[PDB]
Amino acid sequence: MQIFVKTLTGKTITLEVEPSDTIENVKAKIQDKEGIPPDQQRLIFAGKQLEDGRTLSDYNIQKESTLHLVLRLRGG
List the chain domain ranges: 1-76
Cβ neighbors of 13 (< 8 A, separation 6 or more) are 4, 5, 6, 7, 30, 33, 34
Spatial strand order of the sheet with 66-71 comes to 12-16, 2-6, 66-71, 41-45, 48-49
Instruction: Round to whole Å and give the CA distance between 62 and 2.
Output: 9
Three-state SS at 71: strand
Architecture of domain 1-76 in CATH? Roll (3.10)
Experimental method: NMR
CA distance 40 to 53: 16
Strand partners, 22: 55
Within 10 angstroms of residue 61's Cβ, the number of other Cβ atoms is: 22
Q: CA 11 from chain center: how many Å?
A: 13
CB 42 within 8 A of CB 33: no
Question: Is 13 in a helix, a strand, or coil?
Answer: strand
**Distance between CA atoms of residues 43 and 50, nearest Å:** 6
